[PDB]
Amino acid sequence: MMEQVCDVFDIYAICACCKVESKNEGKKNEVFNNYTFRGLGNKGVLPWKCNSLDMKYFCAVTTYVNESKYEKLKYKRCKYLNKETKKLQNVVVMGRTSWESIPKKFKPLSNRINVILSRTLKKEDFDEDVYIINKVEDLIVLLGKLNYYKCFIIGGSVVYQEFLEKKLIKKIYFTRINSTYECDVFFPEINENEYQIISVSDVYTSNNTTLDFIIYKKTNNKM
């Protein structure tokens, strides 16, 4: 039957989560689960400051495009919209707060179509080559007009929260930062009946902490 948005437009989420500093009054024999990794940010920035390996991974994933696979996607999207027939690029969607947390020299993110969600700011407030949208619904319309490979939702906490609730995420590229830090915003607790881990990477060390990358896939709808 008909298809859901997340599928047609290939919308994914990519994030990085650390362990939370809430002082367990019993570090001795505490319980762990996926929810253990949920620290997203702190005071407007990353809880860990910086992690070169995760940054390198985030850059690699959000910039990777495979041109020979686009046509199949072009047809799919066209067919879905009753429509039909530069360098191919991915789309990155972020919240206003996240856009402001990125250092000037990296904005707009290179080789990627930047999209920013905001109500308080408009296109006149930005000097950069970026698209401003004030509604999640507007992102879908835009994707229908753009020529892109994939669309990655890159934060922040408010943005992740609504895309998951609206079920617009097809997969979650989740980095597990295995160390603890002070945090104020978190990734939403993932429902194991809605999402299931399909891949886990090798383990690495970067910036004094180990970390790995896992991929959650939208569990095929009927538990």
């Binding site: 295995n178 090798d202 896992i214």
Partner: protein, 327 residues
């Protein structure tokens, strides 16, 4: 486009087998989560994949314990110590005991009471009156394990008397020798620490399972291969990997090198029958990123380490699994 090769691949698999000569009685749902993963690159899968291979293709055999096992012969695992400390995460593991055991080996001890007094019971069962008597060691005091690991590491070749004797300068101090070779003749291909002393096997509470350790040095980095002749996948191996990974870190540190790879070679790899159900549970658990191991940077001699000089950080794990006989 090269699709003609795809058909050749099929041809070469013409003699591959059917579903009725895989070997044991495995139910599909037994490993649904485990088999649902697409990419299993986390290093812990080197251990889990071996378990799985023994369960699916192992050989049914009886053994010295009478419990029975599923077994295979010849495996190799490699853990990159520069990137993580391989402490299994799909079940809970504590390291106080195995570290104390390692320090006990380094001191060249063979007195089981030393460990018992620290509430480490790893060697308890092998030192009972009954156990010693079954090995025909009638004249051996309870807990006097004989010329085992520690003894062979610091006094290989010396005549064993009793656990209280002073063995200073008797036998070959292999440990001391390997540290010297790693420091002064790093490209040597003879840096081996061997516990399998054929002449003393019978006097040992039990012959060693970890036969030897061979070291390799390159560009300021130390790697270690340990050959294990008998491996209890469900209970022993997880601890063994941790023991030799810690030993590799210790040896590297006192030799001013950075630890690189811990390579584990398994000879007779087996899974005990009373462990099967617990391992089916463990294999459907997804690993967490490994923790790291920190050593007091001030210790510069292999003999100066104490239990407080070791710290495991960020250990995230699933709950403890009892590997019961009954359950």
């Amino acid at each position: 486009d090269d699709d003609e090769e795809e058909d050749d691949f099929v041809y070469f698999n013409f003699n591959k087998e059917k579903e009725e000569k895989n070997k044991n009685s495995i139910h599909p749902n037994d490993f649904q989560i485990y088999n649902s993963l697409k990419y299993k690159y986390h290093p812990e899968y080197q251990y889990l994949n071996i378990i799985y291979d023994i369960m699916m293709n192992g050989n049914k055999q009886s053994d010295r314990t009478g419990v029975g096992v599923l077994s295979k012969f010849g495996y190799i695992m490699k853990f990159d110590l520069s990137q993580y400390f391989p402490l299994l995460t799909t079940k809970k593991l504590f390291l106080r005991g195995i570290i104390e055991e390692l320090l006990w080996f380094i001191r060249g001890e063979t007195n089981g009471n030393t460990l018992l007094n620290k509430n480490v019971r790893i060697w308890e069962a092998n030192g009972t009156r009954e156990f010693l008597d079954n090995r025909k060691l009638f004249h051996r005091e309870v807990n006097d394990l004989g010329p085992i690991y520690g003894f062979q590491w610091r006094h290989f070749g010396a005549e064993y008397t009793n656990m209280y004797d002073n063995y200073e300068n008797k036998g070959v101090d292999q440990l001391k020798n390997i540290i010297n070779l790693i420091k002064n003749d790093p490209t040597s291909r003879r840096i081996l620490l061997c516990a399998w002393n054929v002449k003393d096997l019978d006097q040992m509470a039990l012959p060693p399972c970890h036969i030897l350790c061979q070291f390799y040095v390159f560009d300021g980095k130390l790697s270690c291969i340990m050959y294990q002749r008998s491996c209890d996948l469900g209970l022993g191996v997880p601890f063994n990997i941790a023991s030799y990974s810690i030993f590799t870190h210790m040896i590297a540190q006192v030799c001013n090198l950075q630890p690189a790879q811990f390579i584990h070679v398994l000879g007779n790899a087996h899974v005990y029958n009373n462990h099967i159900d617990s391992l089916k549970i463990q294999l459907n658990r997804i690993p967490y990123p490994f923790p790291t191991l920190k050593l007091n940077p001030d210790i510069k001699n292999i003999e100066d380490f104490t239990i407080s000089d070791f710290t495991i950080q960020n250990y995230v794990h699933h709950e403890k699994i009892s590997m019961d006989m009954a359950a």
